[PDB]
Curated annotation (Swiss-Prot), chain A:
EC number(s) reported in the record: 1.4.1.3
Protein name, per record: Glutamate dehydrogenase
Gene designation per UniProt: gdhA
Record carries keyword Transmembrane: no
Keywords: NAD, NADP, Oxidoreductase
A single BP term in Gene Ontology: glutamate catabolic process
Catalytic activity entry: L-glutamate + NAD(+) + H2O = 2-oxoglutarate + NH4(+) + NADH + H(+); L-glutamate + NADP(+) + H2O = 2-oxoglutarate + NH4(+) + NADPH + H(+)
Top-level taxon of the source organism: Archaea
Oxidoreductase as UniProt keyword: yes
Active site: 103
Gene Ontology MF term list: glutamate dehydrogenase (NAD+) activity; glutamate dehydrogenase (NADP+) activity
Amino acid sequence: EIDPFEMAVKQLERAAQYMDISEEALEWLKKPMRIVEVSVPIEMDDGSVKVFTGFRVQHNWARGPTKGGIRWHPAETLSTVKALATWMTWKVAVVDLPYGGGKGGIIVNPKELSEREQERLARAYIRAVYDVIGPWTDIPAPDVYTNPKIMGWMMDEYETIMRRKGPAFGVITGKPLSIGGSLGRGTATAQGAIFTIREAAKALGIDLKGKKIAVQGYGNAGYYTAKLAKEQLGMTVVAVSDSRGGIYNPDGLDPDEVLKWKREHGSVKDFPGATNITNEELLELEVDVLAPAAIEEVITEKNADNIKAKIVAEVANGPVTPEADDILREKGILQIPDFLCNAGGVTVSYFEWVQNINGYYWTEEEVREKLDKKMTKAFWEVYNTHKDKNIHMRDAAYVVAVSRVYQAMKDRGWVKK
Amino acid sequence: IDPFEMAVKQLERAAQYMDISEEALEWLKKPMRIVEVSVPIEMDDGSVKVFTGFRVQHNWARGPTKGGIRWHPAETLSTVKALATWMTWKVAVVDLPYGGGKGGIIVNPKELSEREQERLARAYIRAVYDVIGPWTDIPAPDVYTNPKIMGWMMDEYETIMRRKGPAFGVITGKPLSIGGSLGRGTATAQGAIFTIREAAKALGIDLKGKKIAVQGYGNAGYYTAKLAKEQLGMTVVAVSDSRGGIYNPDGLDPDEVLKWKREHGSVKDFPGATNITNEELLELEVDVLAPAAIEEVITEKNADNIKAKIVAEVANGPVTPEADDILREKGILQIPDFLCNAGGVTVSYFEWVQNINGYYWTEEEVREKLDKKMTKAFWEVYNTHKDKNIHMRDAAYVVAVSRVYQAMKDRGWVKK
Amino acid sequence: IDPFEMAVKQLERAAQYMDISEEALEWLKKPMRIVEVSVPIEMDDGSVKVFTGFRVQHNWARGPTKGGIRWHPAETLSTVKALATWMTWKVAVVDLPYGGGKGGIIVNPKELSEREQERLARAYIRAVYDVIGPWTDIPAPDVYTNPKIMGWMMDEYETIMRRKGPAFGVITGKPLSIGGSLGRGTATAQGAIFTIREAAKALGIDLKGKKIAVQGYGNAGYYTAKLAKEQLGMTVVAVSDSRGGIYNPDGLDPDEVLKWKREHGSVKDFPGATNITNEELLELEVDVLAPAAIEEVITEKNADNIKAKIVAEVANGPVTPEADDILREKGILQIPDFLCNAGGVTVSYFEWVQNINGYYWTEEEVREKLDKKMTKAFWEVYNTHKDKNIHMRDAAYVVAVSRVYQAMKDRGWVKK
Amino acid sequence: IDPFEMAVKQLERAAQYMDISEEALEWLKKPMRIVEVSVPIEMDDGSVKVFTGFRVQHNWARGPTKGGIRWHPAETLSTVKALATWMTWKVAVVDLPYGGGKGGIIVNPKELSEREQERLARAYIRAVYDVIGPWTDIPAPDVYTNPKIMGWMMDEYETIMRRKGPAFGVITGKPLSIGGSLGRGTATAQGAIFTIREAAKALGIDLKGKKIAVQGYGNAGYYTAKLAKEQLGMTVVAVSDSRGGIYNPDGLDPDEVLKWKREHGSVKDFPGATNITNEELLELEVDVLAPAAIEEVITEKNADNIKAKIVAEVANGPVTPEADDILREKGILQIPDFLCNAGGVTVSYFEWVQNINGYYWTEEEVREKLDKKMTKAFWEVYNTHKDKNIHMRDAAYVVAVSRVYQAMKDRGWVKK
């Protein structure tokens, strides 16, 4: 229907308040430029042919090829896919990638599918959307219930149809390392987040080394943000959590042994010295850095006045709500907005694509140097925009992103003004 | 949505009269590719506006998808989808090596300048270029689009395609100077005259000196009367415009009637003719009745008063389903609309063949081919109706859906 | 490699009957392109198996190469090459704008499920895509491949090609739904009947009422018998198959004995006949003998016993070269195999023409055209044998090799 | 055939030192694509002559296939196939995003004029055009082909390609004026030197002032001696031609020796040197012995008489498998040929990278990148041999085949 999309358009309209943008250009940006819906037929293991529904949305490619993941999910809608493609346009523009925004999806429950039917689905998706994707057109990537395994299957099929005529590795990212993958992909989101957390404390004078962090969540993001916040920033991880509960212990938790416990015990609860707490105890925890590395709107109106960290680093997307926002800005709390804070992920995927189309692969250290600079410069631009335009960090991020996209459209002559 | 859900329902009905696997049904219910795109133009009043454009390609099992583009303020994706699905049956009933497609732009085009119209034509092609082509998807005129717009569209395609292929063949309905076909104007009527002749044959009637009534005196109606008289030797005893009808049991001459309508604004008072009503024309005792006008004009209410031996549905939809049941039980032979008026989609196929071949046919050549095509389509629908004991309408669908399904099975798309 | 070597040797004999430079001759002895590919499939049991496929394009001076794909466990690159070389002569004797190609996979298709067979067919097209296509190299069915597999292959090609061109025309022998041709299943037999009729004409023989015997009773034998009876007015006095022959001086009904064959496994012990042996069948006093089973059935041992006025070689290689001399001494007109049974490849050409022209022919259209290709091909070869005063078989090769060699010179491939 | 059978068996041996599924083993036993083409040229005679060319692409899982073209009168498809197969483990051991390819023409180039050689280089490209290209299959020089021939080939490609893409990147070993790379000429030696330096590091040997002998004195032997001295600061106590060796416990100067060899044809009687035999050179008590001439120079017969701490296999195939066991049991560290001489293919890579990126590197940049790749490659094969406790040759296959096999699984080519 829409409303994920309604929502995306709304936050674009809101940001048009903090910058001069023509109506022409605003209207153009509210429409995804190409939306494709295709039948994705596979033959089940039992011999029956099922047709699934797939989408690929290319929101805007003024700045270059569109970029974005493919989600396999039974509750997938075109409204979601469009909303997310719109957000991708801003996300890649906030870290100055020469990309537009794109996204895809199949309405499927993948855990009903065997490996073999999953490869069929991955290959049938590519055979269906082939004419609108490509290394210089639209470059997919993993997402919800897709992973490098499926990326490899999709790449191979693309290379088969293309007849090995071009950099087919660069048709898609998140690939296995054996076939065009990139080092640094797993750490990407956390690592970028950590750079922004660093440049934030820098801007704030906060010395950071030894100071406290709490990380709400323990997926890949949460675990690694905790790890690097520690072993890279000198912080004391005094709290983390998982879906079923969190733990505190202000002497210093160890993210690995906490992870062993988590996998050992299903949860970080009960941990060695871990004064078990609630998530909101974690959110209302007095730290230097709080990283809600889990779930949307967890700091809303009904808790925001009790958020204690000097810096809120949104590794998770959408943790802080607009009302939550205003409180925190006026509290004096510096949020690193999600799509700037976790852009390290889309940045390392740009790097993957660059290694592919150039036929030359970087090192673990080269990728991080490069990620460091992107994240650093991106944060600075948003930070100085929010200072100079005296607006909230989030709106600054949108003004940075939408200005790039707007400018590109103008320079092509897409909009005259 | 409603129009699309309607098209889906009509397939599920047709599936009641034939054996089709569930997996093939589920496939035919889903359009295989839908494309929605921004279509930006610069308006004359200086603004840049981005209209929403669609191209739907329902199924290409039999060949490239074929179908018109609508410029219309009420365009929904659901209408474009329904029309693509229906177009798959239309091209299959008359055995064209095509699947079904359709497009439209959501715009009120009524007051767009020629300049804005060309820009919109061109911007549409530039948006959908990657999914169309002489061997992929071949558009055509529809609501608010015409040959003029087809020419601008072709030209833009050729310019992007770099003249590397048969670009004329990317779209039909083109002006004659640039790859258009002869026989396009009279195609609907001429095709109908062939099925009327074949229906008569099926019924054992010789139409020479038999009586025909035609409801409607636009292009379709006028040429149906004119050709029935001319080719089939029939006596045009009634025709009618939107206002009313005229009658003369010794025959109206369709040209004179057209002349009269030109001068007087209506067929009314035509010298020697009895003024009758539309609904009276419908009930005349004639060998052929050709509703060439509005839809649902033969219904549950008047269907039992029809006296025609053959009812040629030249207009789309002129007979409702209750009326179907009645006319059948009365032994009245209906030529269902998408069979009867298929000469249109047939002659648009002919155009493509001419383009793709770089060689153009005469009037006589187009007519002879249209004859063959229409004649075999009638017999196929007729024999299916007899052999299966089903209404002519349901037989037309079983013939269409059977073709597409056979093609799907023969490609390995569905195993079953 | 004896199969290819045998092919080369035959080209070398034909050079003895015409003026052809060493240049050209050395060119024609080599296949211009030979592709050998890994064709992997995931078996039903999840295991992946790599099969070996070949595609061979012998010579494309005259146009794209044409030829079928054998799925057979003793396929060798040498046979494929031999067959490709021979295809070039076959497409040329009957004057197609083609050259010759052939392909094959080393697989026993009888051990693969339909799902595994579709995977194989698709893996083959995925493997050879870059060297085949509608104006490059056009495959077709052969040993253990059929229209079902052609449809699968055409489909995988269309998919990789992104429907940019006439993907129907990449391969012939397709199901009718997706571009196949009428006239296909009886093409070989029908082609032979035309050359039989022209041979009779050359001999001054009126075939109505005259006797024909046919060795072999598969599709070609069956339809050779049936069409000679019905079209030529002949009396079918004997037919046979692997298990034996049957004789009736008064005539056999081809459908009755086909029903008996289907019922009992062989034409043998048909109640409406006496049994005779295959050799006895070969020696009957008939106007036409049509060997339509296996190769080398007429040899040095029995060639003197043949009494047939015309030997129509429906099968490939039924007569040995010793037999050629003998029968030609005896005054027996042979219709050499690759001439006699060329109606198949002629009709496959017709199918490709319909595909690339997006326009399909009627049964009777495919027939008249076949009729003329075959007739014309026959008088060409017959008048060569007459003028150059040589064996029909050598006149056939001269005609073929001359065409291919003229095209090579006209391109400047060879300078003489 | 045999060369190929040898390669298959070397792979079958590899498999026993790692985990590799039978379906993956069988896949890897087979060249995925094999092209055999006619390659015609007009002689300066004016006569047209058709040569036989091959191009084999064994496996492209890791990326485009890389490998050279051989002009040689005893060229066999089995040979091109064996070398293509070997090419795949080479580009893998050194972690290039490539797979293995190889090509060949059966010709005596020595009998070909320069004009005719160009014609042949151009015809080869005209014939294999569809299966090669910057992202498909990138050739290189080999036996009797050189940068001069690459430039002709690249040019013909660029002409057929219509300059649509980075045509420089279709073929490596190019002249510097049209996309060639610096570092090319000394790439194999320079790479041998890095591996030698690292082998030393591994053994705790400082090579400064240690003795090296080098068998063979083409480019590879020459530059190995020259750099071992200049870079590694070794004493070159002996080098050797085909004629024989020369020795001097005090040192030979590689440049002097080459001058001398240039002025005389041979190294024999180099001032101050004692003439020794090649077998005497091999048995020299040195720190590094580099067989940079012919294959199977170290065998069962003489392997026990080898006194080098390091056998750097600069040539391909110098030590036999029996010899491998003897040397290893003796504590001698071999640097297996396809790891040790991989600097050539490593710089052909850097060339292709510069070509597709339209940006060229310096001598210094080429050399440091190579240093890094050859070093990193060495330690991997080294630590494999140590950790699996296997011969360095088998470790190099384990490293290489594991890479090619991991890419196949991640594409889903082989399921296990």
